[PDB]
Amino acid sequence: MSPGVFFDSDVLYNARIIPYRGSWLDFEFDPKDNLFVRIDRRRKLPATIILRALNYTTEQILDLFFEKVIFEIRDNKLQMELVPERLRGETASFDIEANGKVYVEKGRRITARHIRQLEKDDVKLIEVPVEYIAGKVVAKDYIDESTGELICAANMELSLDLLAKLSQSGHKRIETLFTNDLDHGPYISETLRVDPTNDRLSALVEIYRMMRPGEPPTREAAESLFENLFFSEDRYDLSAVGRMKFNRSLLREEIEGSGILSKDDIIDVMKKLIDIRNGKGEVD
């Protein structure tokens, strides 16, 4: 097999990095839109494991793959920092209003004109009901900053209880994920849920168990094995030709580069694969 990177499908989309020397790296969607990785053509692992192994926290993972919807708690009411574009294609579930003007009545389909009216008047903050926020997925951990105790963790689905707790604790901003059911799908958020690993070490241990079943690894052994998979040229090389092909596929300006992979190489392949699923761009 010639070295390079490949984006294909079966519709279940996939990506594959074939090196000149070393382990293959595969990514693929399942029918539920969760994302999985294979190392050396071995069994599928929820794909976020490789990002954890590369030292990304859950919060950082969510920031790589999602825009944010910011809510504000104030006057014991709830507000949302509004990007009007995000309302496109929806029906209003509450009166969309600002500065004493109702722009969209509850139950009206939100039109291109409504969005333009909001944009023309620079409306960037609107009141929302608690039920609207309860749908959402929180983007970062929050503690009660007086007691120090955790209220919620990153990627948790919000609820009436958690919203009550967040409000009670004195928090005035809540960051959530922007997702939809079309071009901004929640794949990575859902993938974090099926991923049994929770941090870099547990990710490294899981990868080690998969490669070398039957002896639990030391921290040092797990770290070493992972570094040698894709990040040490004595064990992994994309050959110059491989790096050339890789870089052209991912739209790098230069065809020169390293035989080993970078975290950016891996992230960029995952991003492209996700783009394809979201419908921006196509397979090879």
Numbering used by the authors: 151 to 160, 170 to 443
Sentences from the paper on this structure:
We prepared a construct comprising the Eco β2 domain including βi4 inserted within it (Eco β residues 152–443, hereafter called Eco β2-βi4). After reductive methylation, the protein formed crystals that diffracted X-rays to 1.6 Å-resolution. As expected, the Eco β2 (Eco β residues 151–224 and 344–445) and the Thermus β2 (Taq or Tth β residues 138–325) domains have similar overall structures. The βi4 domain is inserted at the surface of the β2 domain distal to the connection with the RNAP. A 3-residue segment of Taq β (Taq β 212–214) is replaced by the 119-residue Eco βi4. The Eco βi4 folds into a compact, cylinder-shaped domain about 22 Å in diameter and about 50 Å in length. The compact domain is connected to the β2 domain by two short connector loops (Eco β 225–226 and 337–345). The βi4 domain packs against β2, resulting in the burial of a modest 618 Å2 of surface area. As predicted, the Eco βi4 includes two tandem BBM2 motifs. Moreover, the solvent-exposed surface of βi4, including the entire surface facing the DNA, is highly acidic (front view), except for a “neutral patch” that arises from three conserved residues, Eco β R268, R272, and R275 (top view).
